[PDB]
Design a protein around this ligand. Structure first.
Ligand SMILES: O=S(=O)(O)CCCN1CCN(CCO)CC1
Ligand SMILES: O=S(=O)(O)CCCN1CCN(CCO)CC1
Lengths: 238, 240, 239, 239, 240, 238
């Protein structure tokens, strides 16, 4: 029961050299799948991982025919059978966060397992998050810090009380709990996570691309100040 | 089982010419009922509808003895028995009128709330919805159009950035209960009682210091309206 | 009772307090600050605010204290009821709570109305008694109103729709309802409120103090503008 | 005189105006809206505000008008003095000026005090008579005060230090001094004020109208929060 | 030619123990004079100095009959004849006290205003400076230290982003006239008259409605203090 | 009397292929010189120009030993002897603006001549601007639009009245006029522009680098919302 359905994806030309990240383009949809490929180490990212992740996402950003990015983690671990989206630290990861934030495409994080530390922050900055009911685990390790989108932005999803709780105590939360607080859009059966992700991607791609771009930047504008204004006005310039 | 109770309302004088909107004043309370009156077309609004809506709301804004505005849709559809609050297409001006008026505007979603109709509910101070028939759907995106202001950004100040983005990006249909869970709907009520509950909420609001209610609304607006918000709040302070 | 005397010690220099009690945990870097006027539902009078400010300020300057538990003593000797704070310079207490480099957890053991409700809102976290926590924003029907952290900030917790509801109608809500809306972190059984509070305090204190301070100001920075930047930048200036 | 009758035509539907004059340029997409109560230094009474609102609103809806010149007629028949507006719903006029998709240029031909000063502040641009422009923020000594666009927004033009000076002391300033601080775009000889205003209006109207609208809301967006976003986004929705 | 006029001031009762700060009340006006009293060291402040400064300012904040605070430095240096307002090193708390107090704080820069001393001038509501001896220099950067709050960011709200960045990045020394041109100094005055001019400004401020002045200050602060700014302004409104 | 003093600069290894941009590293200082190299066309930038400019600036951003970036235009025009920093449009230029905005180094724009359209916007987003007294010409062409840093940010330098004027009328301004309004830090003799630029760079580099980084982000934080918070908090994380 692996979330990954190989038949639905094709490798993107120009990335045979990837080792820490897998990059696929859907066989029919204007959707790509970017995933951490280090299950043995719970998909923790090392400097090299960040470089590939940035390269891949930047390429997706510039792909005219791609309207949705599915960001997830491959699994399970061959070592213990566990599941992880991204366990965090082992080009800065902050640049990856901004790339996700600023790209004119909807980025959906598919939390298939542990999402801790920097991995948790990556999920927070994504536009939407779908999570495995059985294996998704949310834990902000930091304080055990990310004073940017990792934290402050979480408050714009679950509220100041819950956000402070998540960070100050660093407890572990399930997909359902995070859904109740407002940080997870929907909970899905583990085996169905990616299938549900592709359904959401399809509904998004079925609408006006220009409208989707404008909307994303309109939502960003609320908290990104001048940068947010630049991107929205930039798209207004057509 | 219709939400409207004829015995509780009286038409406002001076609006006999309204065709797309009904405007009533409660027989006893400082509350008015503004409703879309085109059930035959799922209360979609045409340019003429917006003009009447603006006129009516503007009149309510200036009515010294009115403290609460109930915004809803008349129903059901004469030709399908369906319910609708407003199914969408100056409207931006209507949004600001609702936003800036020193009175609490409660949207009573009795049916479909789509497109511009959905945005109207979002900008209202409070929203109550019909459990059985309220239906929320942000259709702008799949219409090529979009509201990058109070309709969208402000929704995020109600349900959070994740849910707001979902609502707009996918344009799915949600029930009163779902929208209530996300935080965009204050409470769910039986369809037949939507207005009865609305009047009870209006009564509780009107039972308090009007000056305090005005100050509070502008205090809540100030958080996101920047200088405009400051002007309205400080405006009240200067008055004091 | 919520209170477990065996776990607290009085703080030297405060036996002159009459409206507030101030304790230091026997082991944890945590203090307990509580309203001490149960006979009148822990409402605060000018004298109460002075003691509260003094106590909180002292806690703010205590280097070995990382968490402040703010609650109300009970029950009322007059009716057996429970109250955290029933309401009425209190604005200065709010800022003290907001700006202090320590996590302030409000433990709502009973009624939290008016200014009492506003105090809970400004605290970093809130835990509430399932059986006795009662939330009610009274001001409006009294002609008064808190247009600062009491109201605006509540919206940053439960959203604009619910926040406006809470203030405009002034209804009473349970711990559970408030938890559902997002202003209450967790609900606890009355007798366990403080025990749960100490467990949360322990988890907080078990982490890097510098990190916790930085995080609190990072969360404040989102809404405190220049003041928020000053505190975050200042905290960074240390490192 | 500042006014050149040969260049303006009355606007149909406004011969009932008494406190305001409303003209349309014979050639340019520009209108002239002016206070018409020189005998009392163009101070505004409730009736004046109504006409002003009506006129500005009409200008706002005129598709072929890209620039609004806001000034005051003169001189005073009683003392030969000059005034733009001496002060006292006026808040609604401010928003109309702020939100209309047209560039509003205030031409200060004389005294600009109290509400009159606030009107100049909220306009997009200000040109002033070197010999007669007099800026004075009176409110404070009257017990009154404009805590919105009149004050806060002035700070976005001359900076926090100068803005506080202007309001706290309520001193009178010349066109030159105000230009030096940043609230006045340019100083002009009295007789040339309107001629210069039309030249600026012409340069504005010679460019893409859609671009000018977008730019105005882009500048507003910096300080008008959600309202500013609504207007910019709405303007974009067109394209 | 000393700025201070003994005949115009009277010591405040209860502060005989001050060593690093002087605190006077004007003989007739609702104005106080708070000054750094360590000329021998270019009025640099040590921890003890900050404690006294905070105490003094806090007392002024609570003085109902005081509407204006004049913040300056005593001089000249006993051992070099040089002038200094404050040459720099809890101070953040002093900044907020100046920022939040419902009274106008005018900084009179009589000499060197460097490091923390420069930041104090920036946070004051108004600044008047000695033409001959005022010297502005943000030395933090070349000290390895920095003020990323009111000392820096807020300076940008006075001189604009370009000039503010220049002042901090290069740490050059500027005169009263230069700082006035950039917008951080309200007016330049003859050294010997700095305080005389300061009292004239204080008199004009005090001649107006105290309530209005309080409201205005908080209205100006609201622009950049977010929720804190709202709390203080709304605070006054509730009072009303 | 050319502002460029060849003896003081060395080409940066790895950029012999540049055609629209020149990239030098000072012989002694931790300062680089990035300049538009299309004088014949008044240094207008074409898509290829933006690509090189971005590559160069990104490399400067990642150079540990570089603390200051001098951004200017080479000249004069071999066609008419005129001077230009950048005349504007002929990887998006918006990405270049953000790169300048976000890099932890002080970027000084040396306006040696015409600064129009996108060229003017580039000067506005730079941390500091020094301009040639005889040849600097500021003109916002757009409306004849940049609703981001190009415009809104200008208002944070010269005030709302002047900013609106500059954009609505699109008039041409001198170094001195722009200096009076607050958008130009200092005016310098044309032949001395770069020498003065190196002096400013030296004073900046003479201070604590960590302090300079913190300060720049503290100034940005005022208007960059969450993005600004992310960068400042990111540097706070050390
Ligand atoms: O709008 S704010 O980002 O300032 C605060 C968000 C408030 N809410 C957070 C979480 N829930 C999510 C839906 O239950 C509701 C409101
Ligand atoms: O602080 S703001 O960015 O909102 C407005 C800037 C105000 N000023 C602009 C230009 N001058 C520059 C110095 O003369 C002074 C103040």
């Amino acid at each position: 029961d692996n979330p990954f359905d190989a038949k639905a994806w094709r490798l993107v030309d120009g990335f045979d050299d990837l080792t820490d990240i897998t990059y696929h383009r859907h066989v029919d949809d204007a959707t790509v799948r970017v995933a951490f490929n280090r299950p043995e180490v719970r998909n923790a990212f090392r400097p090299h991982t960040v470089d590939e992740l940035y390269r891949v996402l930047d390429h997706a950003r510039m792909s005219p025919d791609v309207g949705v990015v599915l960001l997830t983690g491959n699994g399970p671990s061959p070592k213990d059978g566990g599941w992880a989206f991204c366990s965090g630290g082992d080009l800065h990861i902050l640049e990856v966060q901004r790339l996700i934030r600023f790209m004119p495409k909807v980025v959906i994080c598919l939390v298939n397992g542990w999402a801790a530390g920097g991995g948790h922050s990556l999920h927070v900055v994504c536009d939407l998050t779908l999570a495995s009911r059985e294996y998704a685990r949310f834990k902000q390790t930091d304080a055990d810090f990310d004073g940017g989108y990792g934290s402050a932005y979480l408050a714009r999803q679950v509220g100041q009380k819950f956000a402070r709780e998540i960070f100050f105590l660093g407890r572990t939360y399930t997909a359902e709990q995070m859904h109740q607080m407002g940080a997870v859009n929907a909970v899905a059966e583990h085996a169905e996570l990616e299938t549900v992700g592709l359904q959401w991607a399809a509904e998004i791609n079925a609408k006006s691309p220009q409208a989707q771009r404008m909307l994303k930047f309109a939502f960003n504008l609320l908290d990104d100040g001048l940068v947010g204004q630049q991107l929205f006005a930039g798209e207004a310039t057509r």
